[PDB]
Amino acid sequence: EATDPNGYIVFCPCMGRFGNQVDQFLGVLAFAKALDRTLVLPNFIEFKHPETKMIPFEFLFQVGTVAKYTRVVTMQEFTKKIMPTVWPPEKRKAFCWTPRQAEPGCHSKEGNPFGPYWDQIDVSFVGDEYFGDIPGGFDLNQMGSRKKWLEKFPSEEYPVLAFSSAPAPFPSKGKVWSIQKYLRWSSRITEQAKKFISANLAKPFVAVHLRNDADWVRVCEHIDTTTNRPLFASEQCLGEGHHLGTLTKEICSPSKQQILEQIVEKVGSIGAKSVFVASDKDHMIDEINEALKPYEIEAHRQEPDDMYTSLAIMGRADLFVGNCVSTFSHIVKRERDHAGQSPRPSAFFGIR
Ligand SMILES: Nc1nc2c(ncn2[C@@H]2O[C@H](COP(=O)(O)OP(=O)(O)O)[C@@H](O)[C@H]2O)c(=O)[nH]1
């Protein structure tokens, strides 16, 4: 019915894959609340055979729950009710930090997933706006920055702030992690997880995330122990600014030997009766089963490995062993920390 007189934020989760998108989305939630505009829930993005698939927020997560954090609308609602009445085509401007080259601009629809995401909701942009000139950019907790935002893009002139990418830092700040208390798997996904667990995973079970597709080597080449800077999600196991210790290649990219040894250790730590493995490539089922044979238990995977059901299963594990650098693992860690009545235990490869 009524539309928000403070205006709206819509954005493309245009950086990285699902872990990346969620990580920034928590920040966008914090941003929308502080600014006090209603957030249009994004379509998440999945890169497949030839196509870029936009996934409705509500296919993955419950709107009811996220609405307990801040004012939200589904993309379906935005497209049907809000856009036709508050955001006519002549007012559709894109927002980004600073102009860049392909005439310099936001280039909000150049390439993949940029073009397809906006095509999905029949948005073409008629002009660009920049916010990078505001001191502290999208950090609304810098004194004066919020006032400056409301001065530069008032809701009367700009009913919809439409961002080329998430208006949030990457990696996420520690202060926003607990916001994923407000992300709850759709019933569909939770039921797929529950069925796999009851059929295949005698309790208590250890769930492990094996991050090992071809893009990972380069990720872990980033590690230099002398400077010990945060790398993607590493602060999830080493604390903000790595106050707990040193990021190592053993943490980022454990060897097969190290993986098997630590699975065995974690099985023994809980008297586990089964192991679940989620992986982007090599689930190591044969190697793990061989390593677990003296202990008369097995490892199990989904066939095929659906990334969302996999995250949900790892969230329900008695013990989760994740990859500390991975933002995909970070989703599980944050669910285990914040989703429930009380926190459920997590561990990571290479960290004591
Ligand atoms: N099916 C499945 N896919 C995965 C798994 N781990 C990674 N992936 C894929 O690889 C992407 C990794 O990107 P991202 O989620 O941002 O996490 P990060 O790169 O590990 O920080 C995921 O979003 C998935 O598309 C897994 O355990 N199962």
Side-chain angles (χ1 to χ4, degrees):
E1 260 195 324
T3 60
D4 191 347
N6 292 354
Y8 294 83
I9 298 151
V10 56
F11 76 99
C12 178
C14 262
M15 187 197 292
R17 285 178 295 175
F18 191 63
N20 246 92
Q21 300 169 30
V22 171
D23 205 43
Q24 281 193 110
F25 175 63
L26 298 187
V28 184
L29 282 171
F31 179 86
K33 199 182 188 160
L35 195 54
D36 198 26
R37 292 191 171 240
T38 304
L39 185 62
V40 173
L41 295 168
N43 291 326
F44 289 101
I45 297 157
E46 205 181 314
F47 301 91
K48 333 181 86 158
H49 316 281
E51 292 176 331
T52 308
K53 199 185 174 181
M54 318 305 150
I55 309 305
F57 180 87
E58 65 268 27
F59 200 69
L60 304 173
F61 298 122
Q62 305 193 23
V63 178
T65 309
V66 83
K68 300 181 168 185
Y69 182 72
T70 194
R71 300 195 309 283
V72 307
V73 302
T74 57
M75 189 69 78
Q76 174 180 298
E77 284 181 82
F78 181 66
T79 291
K80 269 181 54 70
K81 317 207 181 229
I82 315 288
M83 201 163 153
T85 57
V86 327
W87 208 38
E90 326 70 52
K91 269 71 207 196
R92 301 182 188 170
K93 298 174 192 84
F95 290 64
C96 66
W97 197 274
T98 193
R100 226 332 197 70
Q101 282 173 317
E103 175 172 321
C106 292
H107 294 290
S108 300
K109 285 159 132 261
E110 195 175 64
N112 188 220
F114 308 82
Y117 183 90
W118 299 106
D119 283 345
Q120 185 62 55
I121 59 159
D122 298 286
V123 174
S124 276
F125 295 105
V126 302
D128 299 328
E129 298 278 351
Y130 311 106
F131 61 86
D133 57 308
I134 304 176
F138 44 53
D139 178 3
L140 292 183
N141 287 109
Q142 249 217 108
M143 172 204 171
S145 293
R146 190 187 178 261
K147 236 83 144 68
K148 270 159 182 165
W149 273 83
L150 298 174
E151 159 172 42
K152 186 162 153 79
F153 303 118
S155 63
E156 305 66 31
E157 195 178 1
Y158 303 90
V160 176
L161 269 28
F163 294 96
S164 306
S165 61
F170 184 70
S172 59
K173 308 293 184 193
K175 70 181 197 184
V176 312
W177 294 337
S178 72
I179 297 166
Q180 90 158 62
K181 181 190 179 312
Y182 295 101
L183 301 180
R184 177 134 47 129
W185 294 109
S186 60
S187 310
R188 189 162 155 289
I189 295 179
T190 287
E191 295 304 319
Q192 294 163 358
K194 292 182 159 173
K195 280 156 56 173
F196 187 88
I197 290 158
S198 55
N200 298 293
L201 298 169
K203 286 182 192 191
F205 80 100
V206 173
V208 312
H209 178 217
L210 306 183
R211 186 61 167 88
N212 57 42
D213 207 346
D215 66 302
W216 205 240
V217 173
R218 189 48 171 82
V219 172
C220 302
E221 273 183 20
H222 264 91
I223 294 158
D224 177 17
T225 53
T226 68
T227 56
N228 194 211
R229 317 278 306 141
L231 177 64
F232 296 103
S234 69
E235 302 165 292
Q236 81 180 303
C237 74
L238 290 150
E240 281 201 313
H242 290 194
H243 75 263
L244 291 184
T246 297
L247 181 58
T248 63
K249 302 258 200 149
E250 283 91 1
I251 290 163
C252 196
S253 197
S255 71
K256 292 201 201 174
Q257 176 175 300
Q258 278 157 7
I259 285 158
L260 297 175
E261 280 166 355
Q262 299 176 49
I263 303 313
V264 170
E265 186 194 343
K266 298 298 183 193
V267 164
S269 74
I270 74 162
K273 291 288 192 281
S274 68
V275 170
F276 175 68
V277 183
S279 185
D280 52 350
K281 187 55 55 184
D282 185 6
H283 291 80
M284 294 185 61
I285 296 292
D286 293 335
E287 288 98 334
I288 291 165
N289 280 343
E290 164 180 68
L292 295 175
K293 201 187 166 208
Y295 315 113
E296 298 163 24
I297 64 150
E298 293 191 325
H300 304 86
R301 56 161 298 201
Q302 299 201 280
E303 208 90 41
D305 186 311
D306 179 85
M307 86 181 86
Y308 316 106
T309 307
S310 279
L311 293 168
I313 300 165
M314 297 187 282
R316 338 248 315 158
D318 299 87
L319 178 64
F320 163 58
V321 179
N323 181 303
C324 180
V325 173
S326 176
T327 62
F328 191 85
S329 271
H330 207 176
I331 290 176
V332 183
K333 174 59 151 89
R334 286 181 308 241
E335 181 189 311
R336 299 180 66 81
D337 286 349
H338 308 296
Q341 331 74 218
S342 46
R344 297 176 192 98
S346 297
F348 299 90
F349 292 108
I351 311 84
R352 302 186 159 204

